[PDB]
């Protein structure tokens, strides 16, 4: 089909970001993923004429036989066009918080199906590094709608609505929200009925897609009503901040708010598994939970204030990350 | 033979038509001869009056040689060509990574002139050489290959190198290839005969892709002395007012890598330099072990080794200039710094042997307000106690 025209913010050049070093196994997994993608024709190599760069690294979802590639399109997301207020997409439903059950699903392959504009493909280049600075890394660029980029849901809106009409027409109370790859299905019924409906939607999507991934079928459940209820108001224009702090015996306390000294949300978290001995693992799990909670409650993933050293966090945040996207974080080095 | 890389100029910008002025007669004759030889070799081509672009050209007398080299001022064009892919890469670690039994070197000097240039960008390389006394118009030429001194020649050459050598590395993952200056260094673990056949195969491959490597064996000695590091197939060694202090500090810092013991401190430096040392290379099968020593007054010395008495590396860590710094905090900064360095150099973070009690770190985490990364470690009885007291 004909491609969709996209542009940039006028007066803004493409993204160029340094790529941090990675371990051996992560590089092997990234090479395997990228070779498979290039075999499928969704990723193409580029020469040196493209001066734009973007980090890439491998994460591991629960029960993964192979790692999953993840790209840090934060710089591009900041620097790409104002394509999501005129083409806003769909306003976030306000029903997500009151229901008892909400299940996440992955729809990244549908994004990978549809092609991207040609004159933008230069800006989505990434580089897989090499160990010991032995050779320059391997450079790649996307030929279809990429993951973790907010332009993909905005472009896919039409096809997503075309396939989501029957299910929504079945019963108006069960709602569906989209955020990047995440697809949230919200219901206030029993667990068995919710799971059956979720499976029904899963093979609904499979039947629509002519092209059964174990990673696609995996999802987790969240219970908003289990949370404390105790914000007075919320301003969509302003960007919100969430601060993390460490409490003794592996505890963590997080505060979400747009303005200081007025807590929109407060929470505590802890998990005494025994693999918690790594502080970075507990911090990563806490930050993912907080960001998912805000995404269910509000439209966008927030800004974060991390109580950790810059280099330690930078080195040891990748392997414990499990989400499909990356928020924006800032480091704090002054005790309270 | 290789496919050309498309390249354009910065938008809103036009080709160089900068004026040039007449030169000497012998220099112009040398330039004419060089241009004729390039035209015979195909590196240059003739262009008619339809191209108005012009760039300066001048000859530089080669040191102790009759011939003069042609150099073209590309300072004006370097602002016309688009940005290229620049990589901020640090110098590779002093050969700590891996080992190869046999090593050969080859020459790739002519390769810089064997890479074809884009068709759209050729007409911008126009330079004129006026005739003597300028009674008639001079000779105008443009390059069909990569020109020396151009902004984008190194990046294009590097990409071409990588794309040429990707299949050869694919077929032989054991053999390592690097390019230092005009010398291509190849290292292999195989036997002499197998390595020779592989080198001849590589030479034929590079000839097929057009890059030139001489048949004659290079005269480079086994000690390569690259980047101040004397390199040997089995070991490696370091190089044997207001400004004088910085020079001495710099020369002392470099000697601390393999000549362990670098700290009236001139006498100890002279004494430790008199003792020859060596360093073995990393082995992937065996795991890495890093050991820490508390030298005192905010100084630590770390040794990375596979097996005892065979150090892979040695280094020193110094505390950051602040009001107060706790001993365990310096220890943790040191260990995480060594872990990051090992990740960069080898790719796997190493296990540590520290002279600290296990409960000390647990108490530290219970008391610390930040989040720190702690690997599994084995305590080793060493005279330094570093108990941290209270
Ligand atoms: N001039 C000059 C030096 C040429 C050189 C070669 C390789 C390099 C690599 S490397 O990746 O190719 N490499 N190196 C070794 N160690 C090793 C062992 C024995 C010998 C001998 N004789 C040598 Cl020269 C090197 N092991 C791996 N894998 C990386 C980075 C930088 C390099 C510079």
UniProtKB/Swiss-Prot annotation, chain A:
Q: Where is the Reverse transcriptase domain?
A: 40-222
Residues of the region (RT 'primer grip') are 215-223
Q: Indicate which residues form the motif Tryptophan repeat motif.
A: 313-329
Q: Which domain of life is it from?
A: Viruses
Q: List site positions: Essential for RT p66/p51 heterodimerization.
A: 316, 329
| Amino-acid positions noted as binding Mg(2+) 1 in the UniProt annotation, renumbered to this chain | 106, 181-182
Protein's name according to its UniProt entry: p51 RT
Q: Which organism is it from?
A: Human immunodeficiency virus type 1 group M subtype B (isolate NY5)
Q: What is the lineage of its organism?
A: Viruses, Riboviria, Pararnavirae, Artverviricota, Revtraviricetes
Q: Which gene encodes it?
A: gag-pol
């Amino acid at each position: 089909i004909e491609t969709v025209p996209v542009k940039l913010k006028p007066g803004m050049d493409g993204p160029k970001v340094k790529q941090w070093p990675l371990t051996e196994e992560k590089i092997k997994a990234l090479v395997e993923i990228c070779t498979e993608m290039e075999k499928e024709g969704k990723i193409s190599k580029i020469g040196p004429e493209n001066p734009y760069n973007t980090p890439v690294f491998a994460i591991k979802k629960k029960d993964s036989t192979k790692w999953r590639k993840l790209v840090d399109f934060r710089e591009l997301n900041k620097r790409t066009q104002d394509f999501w207020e005129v083409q806003l997409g769909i306003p976030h439903p306000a029903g997500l918080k009151q229901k008892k059950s909400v299940t996440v699903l992955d729809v990244g392959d549908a994004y990978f199906s549809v092609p991207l504009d040609k004159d933008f493909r230069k800006y989505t280049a990434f580089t897989i590094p090499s160990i010991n600075n032995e050779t320059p890394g391997i450079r790649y660029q996307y030929n279809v709608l990429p993951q973790g980029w907010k332009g993909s849901p905005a472009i896919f809106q039409c096809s997503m609505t075309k396939i989501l009409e029957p299910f929504r027409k079945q019963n108006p109370d069960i709602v569906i929200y989209q955020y990047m790859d995440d697809l949230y299905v919200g219901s206030d019924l029993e667990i068995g009925q919710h799971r059956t409906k979720i499976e029904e939607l899963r093979q609904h999507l499979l039947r629509w897609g002519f092209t059964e991934p174990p990673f696609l079928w995996m999802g987790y459940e969240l219970h908003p009503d289990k949370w404390t209820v105790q914000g007075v108001y919320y301003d969509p224009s302003k960007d919100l901040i969430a601060e993390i702090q460490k409490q003794g015996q592996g505890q963590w306390t997080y505060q979400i708010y747009q303005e200081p000294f007025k807590n929109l949300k407060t929470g505590k978290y802890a998990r005494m598994k025994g693999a918690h001995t790594n502080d970075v693992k507990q911090l990563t799990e806490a930050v993912q939970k907080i960001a998912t909670e805000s995404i269910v409650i509000w439209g966008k993933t927030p800004k974060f204030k991390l109580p950790i050293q810059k280099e330690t966090w930078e080195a040891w945040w990748t392997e414990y990350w499990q989400a499909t996207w990356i928020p924006e974080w800032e480091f704090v080095n002054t005790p309270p | 033979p290789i496919e050309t890389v498309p390249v354009k100029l910065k938008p809103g910008m036009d080709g160089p038509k900068v004026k040039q002025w007449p030169l000497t007669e012998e220099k112009i004759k040398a330039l004419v001869e060089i241009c004729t030889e390039m035209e015979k070799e195909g590196k240059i081509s003739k262009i008619g009056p339809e191209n108005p672009y012009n760039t300066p050209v001048f000859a530089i007398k080669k040191k102790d040689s009759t011939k003069w080299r042609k150099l073209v001022d590309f300072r004006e064009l370097n602002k016309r060509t688009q940005d290229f892919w620049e990589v901020q890469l640090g110098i590779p670690h002093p050969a700590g990574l891996k080992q190869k039994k046999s090593v050969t070197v080859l020459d790739v000097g002519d390769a810089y002139f064997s890479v074809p240039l884009d068709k759209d960008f050729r007409k911008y390389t126009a330079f004129t050489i006026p005739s003597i006394n300028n009674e008639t118009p001079g000779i105008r030429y443009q390059y069909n290959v990569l020109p020396q001194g151009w902004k984008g020649s190194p990046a294009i050459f590097q990409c071409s190198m990588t794309k040429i050598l990707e299949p050869f590395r694919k077929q032989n993952p054991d053999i390592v290839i690097y390019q230092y200056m005009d010398d291509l260094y190849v290292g292999s673990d195989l036997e002499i005969g197998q390595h020779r056949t592989k080198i001849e195969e590589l030479r034929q491959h590079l000839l097929r892709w057009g890059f030139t490597t001489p048949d004659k064996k290079h005269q480079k000695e086994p000690p390569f002395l690259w980047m101040g590091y004397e390199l040997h197939p089995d070991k490696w060694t370091v190089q044997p007012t207001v400004n004088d202090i910085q020079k001495l500090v710099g020369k002392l810092n470099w000697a601390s890598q393999i000549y362990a013991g670098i700290k009236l401190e001139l006498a100890e430096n002279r004494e430790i330099l008199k003792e020859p040392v060596h360093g073995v290379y990393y082995d992937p099968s065996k795991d890495l072990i890093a050991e820490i020593q508390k030298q005192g007054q905010g100084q630590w010395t770390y040794q990375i080794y596979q097996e005892p008495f065979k150090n892979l590396k040695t280094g020193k860590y110094a505390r950051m200039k602040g009001a107060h710094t706790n001993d365990v905090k310096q220890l943790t900064e040191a260990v995480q710094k060594i872990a990051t360095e090992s990740i960069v150099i080898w790719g796997k973070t190493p296990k540590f042997k520290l002279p600290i009690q296990k409960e000390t770190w647990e108490a530290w985490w219970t008391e610390y307000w930040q989040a720190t990364w702690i690997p599994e470690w084995e305590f080793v009885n060493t005279p330094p106690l570093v108990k941290l007291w209270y």
